[PDB]
């Protein structure tokens, strides 16, 4: 019900959950200061181009807990979020500049793709009424009696963190409307959102991949095909650095020594990373490294789906709902862009 | 209700009344927006050492219209005001860094000096019962049919204008002002001296007689007129260009009658409308003169007179204490022929 | 094609002509040099709530010489503008937050109501084939070479200055479309957009009010049953104003005194005012005061609209395509007070 | 003697030594630079609400190397301090917004709280003629000719970090004074001070709850009464994480996984301290999390203190000199549920 | 004590005299405070792009009182200054950004062009053993009794505002000597003509031409002058009667129709150092706009005697005239025997 | 040709590339975005006191990749580079505040020492022609600097196979130079590795092992390097290798009044949590241990107090010297 208030829910609660109080506040350049006693402390630091009492408000207003993962939610054009604001935890930045019935000075008027939380009422509603937008939940929709065609998800995001199912489930289902049509597309690969310091893995080849040497672990999942002497493992051999197209490939070559990434622009919705690594110990390095995080066994599949028979092409593949293309020889190197 | 309540309030009512609504607010910088529809207003821009936020909100929350000189109350020692700000239009601040009861940012819960004001509930009491503090009045606090001794101004401020009462001619217009004082647990006996007008260059009225001739008349009529010959005008006050460097302009009154016949141009080191001696560097271009630090202040011309014909000529060099905006002010005095040579301040 | 050509435009130019050139800028918070010699000169200081680097750009691009009055279009509800933006002078920023074809970073996509400059090559076309858009021109557009209804304009603004037709003639023609269709109807008065200081009168009767002894004018025009040495001329006998509802009263009384007005907020696309205001001489203030600026003509015309025969009768006048409320009390039959909102 | 001097000062010797000499200073925003040669380097960057300059002033002038824990002077109602400031490394602030003869812009006359420092002459007079007043020392105050009531801490601060007794002996001895009379007696535990990465065990209890399995340890520490599996060590076992309401517990678990901790507020001289925990392993967050950092003994001879025979009941507890709520639960001859707030 | 003492000084002396003292500042932002009891003022705006307590050192060490103009030692080629600053009072910023002696932080040792006061003790040493400088002097160089070649200027800048030599008695002389060195020697020559400071507003008449020129009904003015030749009425008077508005290259021009009405003029860039301004002009009681107005603040009388100095019979040609010491280029067309515009670049 | 280009450059290359192409940009206090469908990302954080604009200009155009050290360039006086920038990484500003064809704002006209890269065409025969400057180069040209270490995307490298070189050579008042020290290997606290096999023993062998080994028994290291808890107040630590074993005893803190990589006597405070003690100034350097031990053996026993003067980066350091006939070694 106003700044003071939106302050007040923060240093007491983290989020604002519509807790009645107030705490005198003091904006200054990009910070915020609450005052607690005869002192301020410094609540909140502005990342972005908005007002910084803005972009306070948004982050607070944000949706808390388990969240679904904003690469595809990127990609499906979505441009206003209704009722409820996600926070992009890497970018330190709103997912979206406009909002519906959130924030006064977000709030936007005319129609336009926007994105539905299913646990908030009346949403979904909404939903099946819009032209076009995208709508999400925890538990899939029913029309009528079985499912839906829609998007399934065994990993997300908690407080900000990389986080999957293991016995704990994590789910999402994520539901689409373009020009008045529902759509049933809806293939095939998505990106798991992990970084490079938290990263862990999620599948029993990623959990052998970080573990057993090369040879071992290829001759086990039948990889001899593929050549990872260049890509998929990274070869520091060379003055030039090989491979690292992979989030998890860079994990196993910052265990062997020390490995730093520094990537052009940073954020959790983005699909497909671009950084410049360099490796210490063996001075290889990469200018331009282009690499996104997949589950190793979708990665694998997508190999499975080639062959030795064409001396170059490019096929495009199909994360995060859009088409991705990467380039090949033969198997000899094989990455995007 | 917050920011985005007093936004709401200053930019309908112009100041923050209470009311109720809300207008969304972005911070940017020393500005402060409200958006209205698909664009941005500028509704402040921050002119003090206060987060821009809460600048703002102490501005919306000034004392609006009529309001008391500020001088005064800054030479009596004000830290704090209860349930009010004053604004300084001039300087583009409050009065002073510290509330009571107004703002949760700089509410002060120490015990200091604090400014009441007496249209104000609960302000009587707590002024009366406060071991040091000020109340300003504009009716005089009365013990039955008797008026209380106090500070007795016959002018003011309007939304940052200076005021004063007038006769308005082809009727009367009163402003009045009263200003109490308790240092140590008692109320002050007596106060004395003279006050400063708070009229500035631009918008300076004549409040008297005596200012509507000097402005007017030249100078030969107008000291001819007041008898004023042995205080030598034509520089103490009147001021001098036939030299490089100016004459006296150690009244407000004296740098307007200047520039009426040519172009004046004065720059303040610091500007307040709660500095009762004030400083700045004065260049007239017409016949080019300058003075590098003027001292003056705004005093009723016929003050100032007076303050002259309690000195004494005799003397060689003296130096004149004279109270104005109830502090001891020090002045040179040189005399020759049992005239004048230099009056001047500092 | 940048920030380093866009400054050459204007600090040569004064305005982004398209020219060809380059000089070294410098953005350090709010303001914007460009670099002469071996000292920085400063251009642009940021009035707006855009990236300091955008608000140049959108000046540098806005449209200038002559423009139409801000207010109407506002009041229309433009969102956006194509390959042009509008200043506000008196705001120091754009009339909108948003573009269309003109600054990458303000540039929206989507489909708002969208004003369009004839001037500007395949704006007309543009402007036809838009769900809602509105579009202004200096000439009448006509169908079957008869005039289209339109908002017609003898005044406007002549680089952020307030112009008037008067051997010269300003036209400004207005044209809106909503919900697929034009309208064939428009009603109403509209504000000239003068402010206290560069006031000028426009007809005879401002000339006239202006140096007329109140009371000749009365007179002479014939308005005794109209209240105006209260209602407009305005009273400085009482500790509080009345009256000055309009731009022109405040103008007259400047003439006779020091008057100050410091507007709550100040914008050139604003139809109705509201400003504190401050008489010196004979110490009188509005905290409140809401005014206009109407051609004393056109006022004249609504008052005569009026039943003088009522009490209370709170009439809704149009000007600047919008309705606005006012508050009407008569005595004795003839105008007690009439003021707005 | 002067900003330019200061910055003479941290360049060189790390804070103000009094030390004569000057470099060009320039600020920028919330920056302070020095120039060196034909570049400028980067000295301090001001996280307070204070003028940048100012903070960096203050920021020379704090107390550097061994400093006393800043929670119980926070809770102490400080106000002013005098002839040194307390820096609080985490908040990158100081300890209060008001001085006394160290800052010209700080500085603040009117009689209130004030911190003083025993290490600086002319304080403990300045001590014991103030009405209201704080007294910290490396070294007990004696009189008459035995000792003096205080509290008395083991551990402390050094250049911003947590450090404890451990062959090194650390102590601090706090006064106070209210209404012109000492204090009589002092009581409670007092936090630690200590963080989640730099955590190091104070004693032989918290090493053992570190390095083994619960009950090896519940069983010889005797603790069965109280619950610690639920209450204390933090079971992720559900989706909503139980315990982590002390600093160690949180230690103890970031071993086994990954644990992130999102304070709301980040503050050295904060008692009670509130953040939302996330575990990755075993996800499980939970969203307000409210701990204290808190030896382990003192954290027992509290549980020891409490009555088991009790159905729902709240525990005052008195921590860094004031009083906090704890929920006691406690079913049958045991603990069901224990946690503050 | 650096910083606070220089506050001290603007604050009490309105500039720095190097008295002795402190006050408290705050830096926030572009602006700087100084605390007097519990408030802060303000006592500077920074407009520059130098760091905020940077230049309003360079600001309270500016020169301060009668100061020369600056166009002509910026278009000298003047990079640094030595022991001095001075304040461009219309740009709000120094002439330089770099200083020798003045302060730390702008201060400069690679050789350059520098501008020496004369007044300051060391000054005129330095100047005569540079390969490169500029000198300025209240009081002319003379060898002996004999005054060396330079540039006299009967006018000047007074705490920013620009004064003259004037006059029943009365005369004020107001004088500036300027001496250049370039490649290792004086320069021998010094020609052309020279700006006044003045500005719209506070423009006064520095000759009985131009106070005719302001007083006096044109063809009154241009009869008395015998201008008849030359265009006035366009070309200088300047014309309200087109949508275009044409003439006002002169400061005095628009100083004149700012007289008959309102005149509204907006620089690109603002600054005195300027010898060649360029607004946009708007006259509102008879609309009309120059849109890309240049002009220039000439003596008159400087001005028409570049004018006469026209051959009136030649079709089209380009001319150059030596303003503030720089050639500038000014465009001619003659209908018959009589001016059809002239105008500058 | 512009600011969007070189945004369009570093989003995309990581660098100013030339490549052709634009980005829409906002520019707020010292924050650089780029607007990406409909929100902006943030590109860069402005660190220096140059225009935020411009520095973000001048750390596209940096030097990418293999880069020298920039102690020593600083000490040789440059002021300007030619058509490239050199960036430190640690400070988050340029080498300079000035540029030679680089940047329209910080181009400078006048003569001043000059800074060339070698790997760019005209710039060894502009650095002939140019009385004083300084060149560095990946490959020999004649008297230099040798150099088998260097620095790569901001991170301290060196040779182990991979072989890494650079030569500088400086000329001042119209003729070169004669050079002649050590150099420090800029390496940090954190990312350090060994690259010695002296150094490779110091970390991982205990004390008396290592003194033993390489003789060092005259001067004790448990004072003057090894450092030593025991007291109050520090002790050694003049060395960064002798922080890096530190650090893995227990918990070591450092905080440099200023941080940059050109320096190269660097100074910090130093405080050890286990078993506390702190320095509160603590001068050191990075010197390969075997260059320092180098030093150790130039000096006489037989001195009750001397000063002694060494050359690390082209620069004298004054050196303290106490015997027990051996006893203190620190800088000044």
Known sequence: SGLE????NVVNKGSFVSADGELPVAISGDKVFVRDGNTDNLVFVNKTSLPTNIAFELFAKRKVGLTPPLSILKNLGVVATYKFVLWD???????????KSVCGYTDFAEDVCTC????IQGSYERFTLSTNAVLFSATAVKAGGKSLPAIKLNFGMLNGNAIATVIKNINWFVYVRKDGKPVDHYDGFYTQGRNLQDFLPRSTMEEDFLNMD????????????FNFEHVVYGDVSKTTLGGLHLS?????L?????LKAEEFVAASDITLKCCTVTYLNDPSSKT?????????????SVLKSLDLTVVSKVHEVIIDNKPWRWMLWCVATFYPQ
């Open 5 to 8: 208030n939106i302050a007040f």
């Open 89 to 99: 935890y890497e970018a330190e930045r709103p997912l979206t500049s406009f909002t």
């Open 116 to 119: 539905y939380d299913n646990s």
């Open 214 to 225: 090369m040879g071992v672990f290829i001759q086990k999942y039948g990889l001899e095909d």
């Open 248 to 252: 998890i490939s860079q994990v196993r």
């Open 254 to 258: 910052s265990k062997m020594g020390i």
């Open 288 to 300: 331009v490294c282009t690499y996104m995080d997949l589950l190793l066994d979708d990665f694998v």
